[PDB]
Amino acid sequence: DAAMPQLVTKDGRHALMVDGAPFLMLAAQVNNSSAWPSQMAKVWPAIEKVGANTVQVPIAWEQIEPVEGQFDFSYLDLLLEQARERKVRLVLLWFGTWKNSSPSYAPEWVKLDDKRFPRLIKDDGERSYSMSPLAKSTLDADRKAFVALMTHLKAKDAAQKTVIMVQVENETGTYGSVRDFGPAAQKVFNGPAPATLVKAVGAKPGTWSQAFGKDADEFFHAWHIGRFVDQVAAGGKAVYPLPMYVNAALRDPIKPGDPKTYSAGGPTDNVIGVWQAAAPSIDLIAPDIYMKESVKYEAVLGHYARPNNALFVAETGNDPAYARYVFSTLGKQGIGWSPFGMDYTGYGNYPLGAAKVDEALIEVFAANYRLLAPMARELARLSFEGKVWGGAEPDDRAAQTTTMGDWTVSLRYGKWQFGASDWTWLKDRPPGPQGPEGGGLVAQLSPNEFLVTGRNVRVEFGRATADGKPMMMARVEEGHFENGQWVFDRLWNGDQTDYGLNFTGGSQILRVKLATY
Amino acid sequence: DAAMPQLVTKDGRHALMVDGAPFLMLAAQVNNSSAWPSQMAKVWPAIEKVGANTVQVPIAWEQIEPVEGQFDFSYLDLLLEQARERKVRLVLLWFGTWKNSSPSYAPEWVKLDDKRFPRLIKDDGERSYSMSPLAKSTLDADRKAFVALMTHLKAKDAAQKTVIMVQVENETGTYGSVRDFGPAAQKVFNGPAPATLVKAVGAKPGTWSQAFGKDADEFFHAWHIGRFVDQVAAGGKAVYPLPMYVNAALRDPIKPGDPKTYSAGGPTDNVIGVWQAAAPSIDLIAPDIYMKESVKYEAVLGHYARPNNALFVAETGNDPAYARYVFSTLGKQGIGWSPFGMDYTGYGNYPLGAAKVDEALIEVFAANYRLLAPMARELARLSFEGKVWGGAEPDDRAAQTTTMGDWTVSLRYGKWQFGASDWTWLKDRPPGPQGPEGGGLVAQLSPNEFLVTGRNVRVEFGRATADGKPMMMARVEEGHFENGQWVFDRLWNGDQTDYGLNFTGGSQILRVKLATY
Secondary structure, three states, X not given: OOOXXXXXXXXXXXXXXXXXXXXXXXXXXXXXXXXXXXXHHHHHHHHHHHOOOXXXXXXXXXXXXXXXXXXXXXXXXXXXXXXXXXXXXXXXXEEEEEXXXXXXXXXXXXXXXXXXXXXXXXXXXXXXXXEOOOOHHHHHHHHHHHHHHHHHHHHHHOOOOOEEEEEEEEOOOEOOOOOOOOHHHHHHHHOEOOHHHHHHHOOOOOEHHHHHHHHHHXXXXXXXXXXXXXXXXXHHHOOOOOOEEEEEEOOOOOOOOOHHHOOEOOOOHHHHHHHHXXXXXXXXXXXXXXXXXXXXXXXXXXXXXXXXXXXXXXXXOOOHHHOOHHHHHHHOOOOEEEEEOOOOOOOOOOOOOOOOOOHHHHHHHHHHHHHHHXXXXXXXXXXXXXXXXXXXXXXXXXXXXXXEOOEEEEEEOOOOOOOOOOOOOOOOOOOOOOOOOOEEEEEEEEOOEEEEEEEOEEEEEEEOOOOOOOEXXXXXXXXXXXXXXXXXXXXXXXXXXXXXXXXOOOOOEEEEEEEEO | OOOOXXXXXXXXXXXXXXXXXXXXXXXXXXXXXXXXXXXXHHHHHHHHHHOOOEEEXXXXXXXXXXXXXXXXXXXXXXXXXXXXXXXXXXXXXXXXXXXXXXXOOOOHHHHOOOOOOOEEEOOOOOEEEEEOOOOHHHHHHHHHHHHHHHHXXXXXXXXXXXXXXXXXXXXXXXXXXXXXXXXXXXXXHHOEOOHHHHHHHOOOOOEHXXXXXXXXXXXXXXXXXXXXXXXXXXXXXXXXXXXXXXXXXXXXXXXXXXXHHOOEOOOOHHHHHHHHHHOOOOOXXXXXXXXXXXXXXXXXXXXXXXXXXXXXXXXXXXXXXXXOHHHHHHHOOOOEEEEXXXXXXXXXXXXXXXXXXXXXHHHHHHHHHHHHHHHHHHXXXXXXXXXXXXXXXXXXXXXXXXXXXXXXXXXXXXXXXXXXXXXXXXXOOOXXXXXXXXXXXXXXXXXXXXXXXXXXXXXXXXXXXXXXXXXXXXXXXXXXXXXXXXXXXXXXXXXXXXXXXXXXXXXXXXXXEEEEO
């Protein structure tokens, strides 16, 4: 059988091992109501067009268990077939007790039986629309269904491992109530805070209120949602131990509001530690980023990328401005990135994303994946080894720079293919049609050798070491990957290297040797 | 074997003899990083589209001698094959010790070994990026490689002579240092000025400083670069004596700055005489013109076109405004003209030329070459015989006139195909879409007979001789060349000749007989 995919960590760097090597998920997600046989003719053309190596698809509880204990995995079987025909991998999204905070994807025998499967009670005594994570009934039922899913998946996919990760629930939490205030919940809240949690967050032992103070309510909900999801995940892992993750409806990364106004209890940036402590069976916590401003997008990446949390952008906007952020995510040691809404079913999630999803829109995102897909295994490995840096065009077009050993590396935006970066008389290119669009990635392969790519960007090298030695790009080789192997195309020289390395709208990859003389 | 091409001079007029007759190089140059097998599928379609009879292609030292004494001419062999299939001729550009002042096209065993192959030392004691032309090592190495190239070319092309000229180095000189100030160089500078040079420039004998005064530094660098290139050229000529030339990075033709701010030592207009004296084995000095303003472009042509210097515009911009200057160059007895950057590899040299090179851009230049190519042998001969005059539309659209024997010839711009040139009530055509675009050429075949062509221009004849005799265009015959032979199409008369001869955007050639009555 294919080796089991594994999320791994080495010296604070991450990889998803697929077939025994690091794998970059250049993913896309279908719309929420697309996971049906009738819609697949409107999904696959988009997915093929965008050039994704991985597709995220909902597996709804209501689809798999429409009548209690009568499981139907016929759609999954079809999806596995179609995915394999297209040579893409899958990430299954388990839509059970929570999808965007709500039980709407639970079957009717769950979500219309509140007495048996109870919603949480708010601080004003009225029931929320959102399920109590303290209910053993709901936990047992979601877990049974997830375990059935993992058992069937094991039967149908252990040989090939088409499915490489599974998302457990979708944007957990509750809007409009920071936790469950019903009597069962309050009984627990009045009791001792869990030793595990108290130690994880550096609190003093006591009741929830004593230990956590002003954070008690939000931590109580995060912990309980986490414990619920952990137990769902652990049951599935006991059968088929694929990497598993949770995704986050975000709070603002710079000026977060009160938790009553966001998806409280879900893995927002302030409760990543609580979720880590609550859910050891969940491998990573993934942000869903629908903030178009670069300042915010970069800030989100900063909160979620940690030595103990792999960076995977599980969802992002499909407005064309978002396209370039693949470069920012991979440049911060990301293992994957995924625009949401990539099908031709007619739905568009504007104001989040694009109003209309047609071939022209998908082409915007396709251009980056066509470039990156052939190099994905190489990038994944080099990233894991800690050799990768990159960036996307800021909203203000400011240059980005870093030091990689002896050398400086810079990304500059709005430059032509000719003319020194310091020619103040030469006006920059005008703004992208549909917003900023540039970005770049550089891997330091060894002290003086680099792999360089990008689109709509100038990459420039200088010398960091203040030893006064002059330098040059001694060799710039363009080539491409075939079967994962490098094939020479040409050397760049003269005009092509006098003004940095200028990447336009197509697909070029360079191996650059630097030298002093 | 085909007759050896020869640059010849007769009574201050020039020709490149190819297959024993004058040849006009309607050339185009590929981008600097296009001379590789992988790029030829993006080069040939552009070259075929533009209708060039000659193509300029780099032959890089780094490509031909990647390891010292291990020569590889496989690309040249391929290029010769492909050129012959397309029935174009080649001009090879030797990129060795200098390409735009820099050794970047020398192999690593040259350019990364400064101790063995030394860069010049500036007047502040720090090394330039540019090579010292006083180094015997560098000279011997460049010459050995060039001689190997000429030996291989002789073996593979003596029979057909596909290759008709060779450029020796590319835009020699140094920015930021007017000469070599290192101790070896200063030892020479302190010594006697060369008798040959002193006589060539009309100076008094002495040391470099006494002879040349304020010009001593720049002349020292020009002479030494010239002597270097001369020796490279002479070694090659000793094997295979093709016409050879050098090209110039220009200083301003009207308000030149200090040589520290331009490519000093290269063949700028003030050191053409120094280069002529230094390099008898170089047949002509060719300007590279990236100045779009007609006043400047005309001025450059004036500096370089001399009785002892054939006019060849080795490089010019590929912004559409440049297209018309073929007419100016051929009208000043030019033997060739060449837009730079004519391929579909994605590179564009804006602000010099076009930002994007696509079929639409190339069509602008194609329209002139489609007209001129069938008549190139006839024009070349008539030009050599001193019978050709012409011009391109000035930036201010002013008319151009000359006297050819008994007759006046005028070129007028912005006129319609109907209506007298002196109808002040009739407004001119509006400006070209992408700038000025008109031009014309007239050859006086005998006293009263002319060959006339042009695009977007009105040609009008009058009588120069002030004898009061009335005149007419007695016969205007349109025809075209097939196999170099004239074939009648029709007579122009009536509306077609009442308002001069109006050439629009296509290809027409006329034989015009003038008469008094």
